[PDB]
Design a protein around this ligand. Structure first.
Ligand code: NCD
Ligand code: DOR
Ligand code: ZN
Ligand code: ZN
Ligand code: ZN
Ligand code: ZN
Lengths: 344, 335
């Protein structure tokens, strides 16, 4: 009989659900499998108020198929103009589970982003005071920094000084992609965690660039050299308990991916969980798989572990080539491939 | 506006393709360049004298009347090519050079008799210098080739003339700079103008995707310094490498920049920025002929520093062709 892997129902600690018709298409891929997800706030315009988060939460709930037990955990997009009182109210009311810091840029509109981290110290101090976790997309985006160096540079110039300045702040280093970040997180304290995507465990930059350019593997932070991939694999396989599942499922229509300027992001919600199983199996570390998927995130966030179970079966299945949208189509992670593990 | 008059250039590394694509792209080259080295990587490749003669005629058929353009043909090396076939083509003026692609040839040691014949007859070897092993990071493949293939080959065949095509690294720039009169290189406009950030920051840009891949800024800067120094064994080779739009903009986009329409003005900009216009003519019009033992062109063209607006697309029989720098501006124009 085909091998079965039973786990406590997982959660996705880093997800993009988009809005409108695309939200309606993509939510089911998450809600069928995961009990909760951290829903990122990078809509156009971004979610920067309690009222917007409440309304978005309801649009997500509207799109959940009948019978799925799925709870979106909302986030606030940090911006220069965000009122610390607004963030705190949302946290106190259970609307915002966390706040998300995207890379700083001096040219950012104060309504849409952060100009410098120093400029938002009032909101960061407030998060520290109230115990609200900060989720970080840790890259510095200065034009003179090579794209492959941007994560490592963030550690030195932003992450370490911030954590020294605000010693009680809880931080998730999202979607880490480098040995630099893996080591930093491994050597950190109980207030520092990380998420890792399936693509950054499965692939390295050669997969994106050798034999052709593959925009469906193009995402931020960019896939790194093999030595970084291996460090990430070793970190999850070690059993380190402050790394956890965050897909960064980030859907874009096919025409927006396969263009003269392809958008960053992998639509991996359909195939992520089986992909993680494949990685943990290859690393001879399946004894750490459930904790990564279903325990470590809840522990860091101070939330209960799910009390229902799901099963993956080690039986081969083909991934769809594409998934229809109202207009155009979405190309899933591993489209058309035969995969080793799927959900029963 | 400033005007720069130069000897008519040549393009020492060009892909013209075949069929309808050839008809579309040839005029962008023939209107400007006196000669071009026409690469042999057709499907199937040009590996015989007969095939090269027929291809040359198809190229000439596509050259507008009044363009004095001569294609210089090349042979695609393979592990099993007959040295007599290659020499015959050289002696007949059919093959100007032979091109070594990384695997076709199973290995270089496998082609030693062909390379020995080339050395004896004075036929230049044009090298796409990358190693191919799956575990080698793509950004390392040029540097690794220098140590494991290029330096051993040149030590074995010390009289062989070699062009290190489309160099992309400080490693290659330094190797060529420090080499002897039997080693030269070509450099494309894209590897002087851009680095990998331009291809990957703010979106993935398949029209900048080419082999050898764009490298880190430190490599770009080394290439710029090399051409600006006046070093006389580097010369213009566009590696213009056209593909239809939806072969580029795809789930697995093809490598190659269609830069023939914009290359010359783009090079002029680089030389100007590097305060090295005194070395521009030699790069475009003298160094390559010197290395190949061919006369310089006897006509002259002018560039003017007036912005040229690059077309968004070029019509094909099916699909379109997106020029390198589509919709952008080039600072220098051909008068
Ligand atoms: N440079 C490229 O990316 N492509 C060239 C091949 C080559 O010059 O090696 C082509 O012919 O398409
Ligand atoms: O930081 C990001 C954003 C995400 C998206 O498309 O929302 N896509 C990515 O690849 N990374
Ligand atoms: Zn991110
Ligand atoms: Zn994200
Ligand atoms: Zn080449
Ligand atoms: Zn080429």
């Amino acid at each position: 009989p085909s091998q079965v892997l039973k786990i406590r129902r997982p959660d996705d600690w880093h997800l993009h659900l988009r809005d409108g018709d695309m939200l309606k298409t993509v939510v089911p891929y998450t809600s069928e499998i995961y009990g909760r997800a951290i829903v990122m706030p990078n809509l156009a315009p971004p979610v920067t108020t309690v009222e917007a988060a409440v309304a978005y939460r309801q649009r997500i709930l509207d799109a959940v198929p009948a019978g799925h037990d799925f709870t979106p955990l909302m986030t606030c997009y940090l911006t220069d103009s965000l009122d610390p009182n607004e963030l705190e109210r949302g946290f106190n009311e259970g609307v915002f589970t966390a706040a998300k810091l995207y890379p700083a840029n001096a040219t950012a509109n104060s309504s849409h982003g952060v100009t410098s981290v120093d400029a938002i110290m009032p909101v960061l101090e407030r998060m520290e005071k109230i115990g609200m976790p900060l989720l970080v997309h840790g890259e510095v985006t200065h034009a003179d920094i090579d794209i492959f160096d941007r994560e490592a540079r963030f550690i030195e110039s932003v992450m370490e000084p911030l954590r020294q300045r605000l010693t009680a702040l809880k931080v998730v280093f999202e979607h880490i992609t480098t040995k630099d970040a893996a080591d930093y997180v491994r050597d950190g304290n109980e207030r520092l965690a990380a998420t890792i995507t399936p693509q950054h465990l499965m692939f390295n930059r050669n997969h994106m660039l050798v034999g052709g350019v593959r925009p469906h593997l193009y995402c931020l932070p960019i896939l790194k050299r093999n030595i970084h991939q291996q460090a990430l694999r070793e970190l999850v396989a070690s059993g380190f308990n402050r790394v956890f599942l965050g897909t960064d499922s980030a859907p874009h229509a096919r025409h927006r991916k396969e263009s003269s300027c392809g958008c960053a992001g992998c639509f991996n919600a359909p195939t992520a969980l089986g992909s993680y199983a494949t990685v943990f199996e290859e690393m001879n570390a399946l004894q750490h798989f459930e904790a990564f998927c279903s325990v470590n995130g809840p522990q860091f966030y101070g939330l209960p572990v799910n009390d229902t179970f799901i099963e993956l079966v080690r039986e081969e299945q083909q991934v769809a080539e594409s998934i229809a949208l109202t207009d155009d189509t979405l190309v899933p992670f591993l489209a058309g491939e035969t995969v080793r593990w799927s959900v029963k």
